[PDB]
N, CA, C and O atoms as a DFTB+ gen file, in Angstrom:
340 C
 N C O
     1  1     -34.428      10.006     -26.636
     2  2     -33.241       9.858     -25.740
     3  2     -31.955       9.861     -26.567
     4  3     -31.645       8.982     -27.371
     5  1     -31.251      10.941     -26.278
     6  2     -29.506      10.797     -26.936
     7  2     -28.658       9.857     -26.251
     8  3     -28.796       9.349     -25.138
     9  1     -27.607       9.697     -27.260
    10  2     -26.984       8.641     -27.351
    11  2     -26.147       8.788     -25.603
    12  3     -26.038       7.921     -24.735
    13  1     -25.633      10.362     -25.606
    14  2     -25.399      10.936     -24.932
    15  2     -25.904      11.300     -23.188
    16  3     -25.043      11.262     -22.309
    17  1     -27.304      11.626     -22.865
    18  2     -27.972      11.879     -22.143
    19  2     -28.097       9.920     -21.551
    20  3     -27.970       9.521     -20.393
    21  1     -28.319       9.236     -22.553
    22  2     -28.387       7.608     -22.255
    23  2     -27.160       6.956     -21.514
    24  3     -27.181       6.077     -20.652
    25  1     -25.960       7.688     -22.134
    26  2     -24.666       6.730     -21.548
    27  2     -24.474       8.242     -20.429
    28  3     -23.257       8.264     -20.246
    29  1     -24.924       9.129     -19.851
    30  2     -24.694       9.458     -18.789
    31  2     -25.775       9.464     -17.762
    32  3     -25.681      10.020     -16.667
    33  1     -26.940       8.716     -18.255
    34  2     -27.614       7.946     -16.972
    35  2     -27.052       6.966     -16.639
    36  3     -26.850       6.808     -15.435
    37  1     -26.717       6.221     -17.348
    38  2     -25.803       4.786     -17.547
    39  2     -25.126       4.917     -16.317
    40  3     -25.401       4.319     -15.277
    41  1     -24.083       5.865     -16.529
    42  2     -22.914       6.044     -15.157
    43  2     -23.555       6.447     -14.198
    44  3     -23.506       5.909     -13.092
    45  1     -24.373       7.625     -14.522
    46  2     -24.690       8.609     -13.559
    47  2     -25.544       7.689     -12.232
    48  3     -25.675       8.174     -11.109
    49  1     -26.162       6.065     -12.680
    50  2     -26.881       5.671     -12.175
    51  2     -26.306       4.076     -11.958
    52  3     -27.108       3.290     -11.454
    53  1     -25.212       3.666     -12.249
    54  2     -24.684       2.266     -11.653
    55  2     -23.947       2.644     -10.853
    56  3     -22.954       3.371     -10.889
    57  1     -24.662       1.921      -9.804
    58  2     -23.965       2.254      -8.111
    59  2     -22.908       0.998      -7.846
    60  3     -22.948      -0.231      -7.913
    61  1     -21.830       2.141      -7.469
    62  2     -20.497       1.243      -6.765
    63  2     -19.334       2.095      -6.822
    64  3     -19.736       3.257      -6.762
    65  1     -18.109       2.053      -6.909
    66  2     -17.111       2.353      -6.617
    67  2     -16.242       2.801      -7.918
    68  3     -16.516       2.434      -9.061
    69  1     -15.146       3.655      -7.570
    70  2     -14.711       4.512      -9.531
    71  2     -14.536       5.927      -8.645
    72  3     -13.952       6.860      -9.196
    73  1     -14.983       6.077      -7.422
    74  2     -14.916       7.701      -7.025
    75  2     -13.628       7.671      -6.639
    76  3     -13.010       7.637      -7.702
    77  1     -12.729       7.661      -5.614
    78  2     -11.462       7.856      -5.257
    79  2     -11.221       9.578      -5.947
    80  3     -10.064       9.950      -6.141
    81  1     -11.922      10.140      -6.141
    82  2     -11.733      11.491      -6.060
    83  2     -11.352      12.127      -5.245
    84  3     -11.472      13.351      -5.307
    85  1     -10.716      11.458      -4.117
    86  2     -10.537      11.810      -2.562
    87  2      -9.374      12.133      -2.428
    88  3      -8.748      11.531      -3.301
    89  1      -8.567      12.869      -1.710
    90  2      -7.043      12.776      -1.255
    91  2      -6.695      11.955      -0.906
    92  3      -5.708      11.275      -1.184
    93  1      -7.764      11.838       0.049
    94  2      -7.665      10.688       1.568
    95  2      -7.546       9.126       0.863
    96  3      -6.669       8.395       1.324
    97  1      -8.386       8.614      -0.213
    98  2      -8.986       7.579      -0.426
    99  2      -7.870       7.442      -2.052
   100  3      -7.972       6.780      -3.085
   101  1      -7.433       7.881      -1.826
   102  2      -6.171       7.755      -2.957
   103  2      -4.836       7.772      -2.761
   104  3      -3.991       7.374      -3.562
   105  1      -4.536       8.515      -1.049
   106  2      -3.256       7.632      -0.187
   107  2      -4.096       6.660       0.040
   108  3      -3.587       5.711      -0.557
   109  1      -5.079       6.291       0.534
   110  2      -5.422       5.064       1.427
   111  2      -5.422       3.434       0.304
   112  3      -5.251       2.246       0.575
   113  1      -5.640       4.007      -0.681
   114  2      -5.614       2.964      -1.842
   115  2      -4.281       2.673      -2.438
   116  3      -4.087       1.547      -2.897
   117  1      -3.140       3.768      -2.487
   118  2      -1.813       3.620      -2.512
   119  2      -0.864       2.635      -1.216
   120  3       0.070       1.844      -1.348
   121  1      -1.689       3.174       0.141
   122  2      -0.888       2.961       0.970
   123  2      -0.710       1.075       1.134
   124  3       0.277       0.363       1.322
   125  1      -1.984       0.812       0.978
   126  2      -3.029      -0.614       0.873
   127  2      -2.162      -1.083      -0.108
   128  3      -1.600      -2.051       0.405
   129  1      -1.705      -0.910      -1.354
   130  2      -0.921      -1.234      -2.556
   131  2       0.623      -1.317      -2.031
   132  3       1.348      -2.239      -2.404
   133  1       0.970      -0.547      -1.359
   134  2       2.220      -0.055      -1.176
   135  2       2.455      -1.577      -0.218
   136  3       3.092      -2.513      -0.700
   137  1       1.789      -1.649       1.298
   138  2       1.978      -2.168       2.281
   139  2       1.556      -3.647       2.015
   140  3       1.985      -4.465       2.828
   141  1       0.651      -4.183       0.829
   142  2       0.959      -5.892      -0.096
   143  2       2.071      -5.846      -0.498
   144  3       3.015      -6.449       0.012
   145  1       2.139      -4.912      -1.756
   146  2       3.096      -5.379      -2.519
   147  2       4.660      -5.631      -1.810
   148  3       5.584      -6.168      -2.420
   149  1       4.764      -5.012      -0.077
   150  2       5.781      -4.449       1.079
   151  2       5.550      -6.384       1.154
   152  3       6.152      -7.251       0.521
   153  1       4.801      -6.472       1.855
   154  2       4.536      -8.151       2.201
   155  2       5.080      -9.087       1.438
   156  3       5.565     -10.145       1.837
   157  1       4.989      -8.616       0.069
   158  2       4.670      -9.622      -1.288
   159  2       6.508     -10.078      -1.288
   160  3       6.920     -11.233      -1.185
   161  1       7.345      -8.886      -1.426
   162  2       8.593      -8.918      -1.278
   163  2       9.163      -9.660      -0.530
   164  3      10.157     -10.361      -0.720
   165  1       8.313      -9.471       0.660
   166  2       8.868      -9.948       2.111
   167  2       9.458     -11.775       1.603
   168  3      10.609     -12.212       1.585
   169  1       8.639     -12.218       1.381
   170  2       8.733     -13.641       1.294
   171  2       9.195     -13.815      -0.145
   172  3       9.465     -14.995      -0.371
   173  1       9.452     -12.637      -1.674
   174  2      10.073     -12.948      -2.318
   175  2      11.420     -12.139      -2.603
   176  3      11.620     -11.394      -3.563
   177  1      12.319     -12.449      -1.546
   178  2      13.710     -11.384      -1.859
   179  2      13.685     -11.406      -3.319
   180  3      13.340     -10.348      -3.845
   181  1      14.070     -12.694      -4.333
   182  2      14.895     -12.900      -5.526
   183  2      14.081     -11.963      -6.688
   184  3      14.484     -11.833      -7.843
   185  1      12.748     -11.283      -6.092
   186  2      12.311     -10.730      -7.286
   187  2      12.954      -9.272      -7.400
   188  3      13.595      -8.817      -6.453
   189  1      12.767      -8.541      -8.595
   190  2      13.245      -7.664      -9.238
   191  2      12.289      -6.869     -10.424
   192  3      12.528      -5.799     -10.983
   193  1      11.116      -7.795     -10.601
   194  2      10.347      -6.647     -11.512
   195  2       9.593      -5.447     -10.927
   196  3       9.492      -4.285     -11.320
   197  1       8.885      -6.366      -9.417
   198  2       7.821      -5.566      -8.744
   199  2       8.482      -4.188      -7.903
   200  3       7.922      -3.320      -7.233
   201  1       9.956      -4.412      -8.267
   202  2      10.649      -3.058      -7.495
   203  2      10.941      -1.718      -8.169
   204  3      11.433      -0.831      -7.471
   205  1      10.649      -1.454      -9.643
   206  2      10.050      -0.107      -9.858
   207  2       8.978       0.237      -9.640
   208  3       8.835       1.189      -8.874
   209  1       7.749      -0.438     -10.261
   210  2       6.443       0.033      -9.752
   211  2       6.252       0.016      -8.188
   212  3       5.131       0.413      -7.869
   213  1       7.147      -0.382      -7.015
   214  2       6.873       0.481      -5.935
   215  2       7.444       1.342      -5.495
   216  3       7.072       1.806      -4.417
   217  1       8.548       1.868      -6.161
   218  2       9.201       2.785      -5.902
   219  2       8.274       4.012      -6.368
   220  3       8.313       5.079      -5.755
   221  1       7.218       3.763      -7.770
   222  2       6.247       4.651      -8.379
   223  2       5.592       4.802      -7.546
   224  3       5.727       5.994      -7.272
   225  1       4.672       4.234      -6.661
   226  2       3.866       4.133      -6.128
   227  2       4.172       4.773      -4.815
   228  3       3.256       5.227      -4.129
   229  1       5.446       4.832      -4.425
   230  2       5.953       5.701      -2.820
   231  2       5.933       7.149      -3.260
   232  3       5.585       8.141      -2.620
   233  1       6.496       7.018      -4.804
   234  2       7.029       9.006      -4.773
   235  2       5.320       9.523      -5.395
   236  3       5.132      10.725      -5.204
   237  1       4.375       8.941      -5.936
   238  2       2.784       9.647      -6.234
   239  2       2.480       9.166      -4.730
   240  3       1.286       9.455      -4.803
   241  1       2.579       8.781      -3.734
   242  2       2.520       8.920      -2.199
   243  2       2.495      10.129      -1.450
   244  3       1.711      10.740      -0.724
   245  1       3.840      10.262      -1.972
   246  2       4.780      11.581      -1.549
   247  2       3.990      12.735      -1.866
   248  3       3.526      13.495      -1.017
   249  1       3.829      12.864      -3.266
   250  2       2.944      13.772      -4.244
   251  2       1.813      14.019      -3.232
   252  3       1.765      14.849      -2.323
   253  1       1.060      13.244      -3.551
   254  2      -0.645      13.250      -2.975
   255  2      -0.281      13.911      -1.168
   256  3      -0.929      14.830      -0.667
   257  1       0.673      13.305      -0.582
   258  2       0.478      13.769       0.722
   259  2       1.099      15.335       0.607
   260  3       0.514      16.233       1.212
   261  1       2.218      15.608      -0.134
   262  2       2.511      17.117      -0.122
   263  2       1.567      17.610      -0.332
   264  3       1.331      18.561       0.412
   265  1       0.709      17.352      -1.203
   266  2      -0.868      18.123      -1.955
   267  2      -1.833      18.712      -0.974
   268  3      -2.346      19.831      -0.981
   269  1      -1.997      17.534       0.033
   270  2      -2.841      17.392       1.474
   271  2      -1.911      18.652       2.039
   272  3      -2.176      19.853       1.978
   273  1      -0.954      18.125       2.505
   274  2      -0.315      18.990       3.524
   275  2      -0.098      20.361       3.533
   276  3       0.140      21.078       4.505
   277  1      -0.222      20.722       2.112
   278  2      -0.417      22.266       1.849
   279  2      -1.848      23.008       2.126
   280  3      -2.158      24.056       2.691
   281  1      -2.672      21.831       1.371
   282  2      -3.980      22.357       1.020
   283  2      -4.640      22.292       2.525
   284  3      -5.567      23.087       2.681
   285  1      -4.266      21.366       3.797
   286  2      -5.276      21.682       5.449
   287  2      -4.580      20.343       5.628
   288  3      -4.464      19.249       5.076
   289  1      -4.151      21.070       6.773
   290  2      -3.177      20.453       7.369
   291  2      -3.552      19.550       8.911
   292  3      -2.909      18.886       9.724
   293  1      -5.128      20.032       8.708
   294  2      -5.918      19.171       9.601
   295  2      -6.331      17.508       9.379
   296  3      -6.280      16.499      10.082
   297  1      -6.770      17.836       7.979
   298  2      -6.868      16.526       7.057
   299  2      -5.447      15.970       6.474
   300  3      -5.549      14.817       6.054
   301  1      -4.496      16.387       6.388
   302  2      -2.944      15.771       5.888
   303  2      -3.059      15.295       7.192
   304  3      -3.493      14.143       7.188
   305  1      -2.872      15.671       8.148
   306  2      -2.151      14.762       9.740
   307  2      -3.491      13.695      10.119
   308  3      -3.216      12.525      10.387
   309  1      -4.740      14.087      10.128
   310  2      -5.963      12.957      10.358
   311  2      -5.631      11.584       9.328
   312  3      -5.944      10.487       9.789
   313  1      -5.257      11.615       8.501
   314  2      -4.969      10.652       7.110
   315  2      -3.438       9.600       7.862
   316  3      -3.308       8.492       8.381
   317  1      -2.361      10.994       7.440
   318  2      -1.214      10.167       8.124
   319  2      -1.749       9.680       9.618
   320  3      -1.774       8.452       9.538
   321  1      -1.985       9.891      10.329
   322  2      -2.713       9.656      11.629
   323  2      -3.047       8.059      11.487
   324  3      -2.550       7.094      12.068
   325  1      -4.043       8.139      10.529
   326  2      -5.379       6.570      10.395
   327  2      -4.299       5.623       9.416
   328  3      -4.125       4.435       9.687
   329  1      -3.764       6.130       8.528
   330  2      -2.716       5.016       8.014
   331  2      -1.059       4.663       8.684
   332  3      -0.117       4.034       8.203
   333  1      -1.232       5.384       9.993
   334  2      -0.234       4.716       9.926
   335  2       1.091       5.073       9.772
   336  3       1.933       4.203       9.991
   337  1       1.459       6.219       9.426
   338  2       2.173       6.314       8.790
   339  2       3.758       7.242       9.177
   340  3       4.643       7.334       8.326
């Protein structure tokens, strides 16, 4: 057994989560991020660090949904549709 062939049963075979290979499931994990950290604010006006990283987090939003919206435009509107948005 290679060292190789060993550490890609390894992955190939611990079951759980790491896929987000998805369009869908990578707004939906942004949006989820977006709409705490939206909350988190809520009740702390005086902060000031957590307000670049969501400004990051709206425009790779933006990104990912232009991506959708080009690539089927059936699945861009089903997505915006279920989040909400």
């Amino acid at each position: 057994l290679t060292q190789e062939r060993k550490r890609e049963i390894i992955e190939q075979f611990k079951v759980h989560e790491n896929d987000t290979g998805s369009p869908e499931v990578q707004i939906a994990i942004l949006t989820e991020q977006i709409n705490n950290l939206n909350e988190h604010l809520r009740v702390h006006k005086k902060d000031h660090h957590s307000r670049r990283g969501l400004l990051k987090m709206v425009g790779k939003r933006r990104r990912l949904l232009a991506y959708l919206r080009n690539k089927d435009v059936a699945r861009y509107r089903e997505i915006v549709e279920k989040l909400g948005l």
